[PDB]
Design a protein around this nucleic acid. Sequence first.
RNA 1: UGAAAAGAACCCCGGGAGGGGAGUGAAAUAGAGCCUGAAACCGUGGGCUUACAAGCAGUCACGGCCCCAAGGGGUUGUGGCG
RNA 2: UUAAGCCCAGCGCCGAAGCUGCGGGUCUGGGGGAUGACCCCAGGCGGUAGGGGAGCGUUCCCGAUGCCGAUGAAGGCCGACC
Lengths: 117, 113, 59, 101, 138
Amino acid sequence: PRAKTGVVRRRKHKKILKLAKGYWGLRSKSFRKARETLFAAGNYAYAHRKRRKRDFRRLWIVRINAACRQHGLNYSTFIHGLKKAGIEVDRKNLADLAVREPQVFAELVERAKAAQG
Amino acid sequence: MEAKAIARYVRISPRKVRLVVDLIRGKSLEEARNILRYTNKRGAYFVAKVLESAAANAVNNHDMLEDRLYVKAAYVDEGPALKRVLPRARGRADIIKKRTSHITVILGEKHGK
Amino acid sequence: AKHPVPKKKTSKARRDARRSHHALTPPTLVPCPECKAMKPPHTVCPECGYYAGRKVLEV
Amino acid sequence: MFAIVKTGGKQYRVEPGLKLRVEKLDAEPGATVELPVLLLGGEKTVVGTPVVEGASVVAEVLGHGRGKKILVSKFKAKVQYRRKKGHRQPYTELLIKEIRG
Amino acid sequence: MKTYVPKQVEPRWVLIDAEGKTLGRLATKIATLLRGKHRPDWTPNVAMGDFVVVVNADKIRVTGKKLEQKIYTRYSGYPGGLKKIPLEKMLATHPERVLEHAVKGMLPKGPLGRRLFKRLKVYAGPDHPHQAQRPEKL
RNA sequence: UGAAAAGAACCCCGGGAGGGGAGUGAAAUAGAGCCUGAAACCGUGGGCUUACAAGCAGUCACGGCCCCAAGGGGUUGUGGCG
RNA sequence: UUAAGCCCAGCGCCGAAGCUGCGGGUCUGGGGGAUGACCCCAGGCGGUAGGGGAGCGUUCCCGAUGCCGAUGAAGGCCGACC
């Protein structure tokens, strides 16, 4: 019984190709130029999903800081003013208040400096 | 509507005629005629003939009326090439490819308001 | 087959890119008197001909 | 009204009626009600007061027409001769319907 | 799930000059200003921020001595010479740049920071014949 | 090739070749080195996109344009990482 | 340039795929346990040469004097579905 390569492969490749559609050159026309790419693409995404997370961490701080800086205080001071006050809240993210409904934030600021009277 | 022509296995490299062709893409049949008539290339005599026949067809076969038709579209495709051996110095010998072409031309009616 | 040689297959890109300036240029023809046909400028076309100059045949 | 509840180590701000994913909960059935903690009233004509974990009893009333969702992904680690495409994570989602504050 | 995006703002300029300051110690603040780093509607990819305008150029102090101590290599023609220039020069022979450069090396390297540097508008004034809304900042 | 030559009469373009109609056939993208006809590769048309910007060509993120709508596809202008 | 340098003190932020939080996966250990392999608890899960364990497909035979099959097989080309 001679088992020909037959179909198998062709399919095995069409798959990887689809995956690499829209890429640059042979990069998306070569059963292997594609492969090699899909590899980088591999970690790239993976490594990034790890970045994205801490990407917004920072992306927010700026806001927070560049927001509560208007009320004469450091994001540094600010935060501390909370930790020693109590607030497993705000979530550097949820300090979206600094923008939408800034009055909500205001109380917080004043709330902040409070703990440091 | 539209009248086709297509003259296969011409014997002239595609790249070569594609040139005369893009020279008439979308134009008055009346004009293209003149054009090719004075375009210095070999493609001329080929795309000429064809384009001329698309006209014929257009009339004789699809009652489209000469005066109103132009060049809906036209293009050229690679045909099966003829490989030939070329004696090279120091007995190297190479295979030269006498390429071949498929000239397609499709007329169409211009307007009617 | 010798000394200087292509170091890489040229990308279909830079290939076409190189041809940008290849486009052919339509010939330049004009009305022409007698016949409502076409001829290129400064030319005697074999149909009507010229004045004071020969050509093909007419009457 | 405004409000900020915490769920799945994550905290969101909710309004008077809406929601998205939140992460699997023992709320076994779809048509069920659960109430997650709160963190800042909402400032509207009803209040606007936060506080230390704001554990002031009040919470958000949430129903939820869900069913453990998923999603594509494909996690292909890759070193060198080491490939491990052996990963498909869809992650279980839990759709909720925020009711009252 | 959340989101936090700003729509099309309206460039709110700023006229400024503290020629009693040290460029750099100033430049930064200017740059900081350039990109909307102060305005809490951040978007590093947008290109929203003050249209900063500095007047009364020079007159700028500059700490210790840069009497040819501060050199501006900046220029490298191409054949064999990397033309250097001391401060004194730029000050006398058309200044302004003095501060300009100080700002460039503070704004990000991309077509953006490139675009942001396009905002800065410094003159060897006083006099900024170019405004319709100078909101002089302190 | 097709079950079978029924393998394309006749008219038209063309010196021919090739074609366009016509006609045979279940099928002619079954028309003759003709079943099916993959890939590389060459084209035409359309959509998004590019002429101040520096790259293993992707990935993450927002924003815009194009076909169905508390979603999706396609593309990609900046930004981040490589 | 009374610093964005150096030395001596104080407080606070930032910050990794580290550790917590929430959810899912898997392998060992111990018990539940009307065994049902169906759930708790506690730990582990970077990896070349290697070692071990599970699986997926291709051709062929038994199943076949069978069952699908023109109300369309095989192969091909698409798809954001499962």
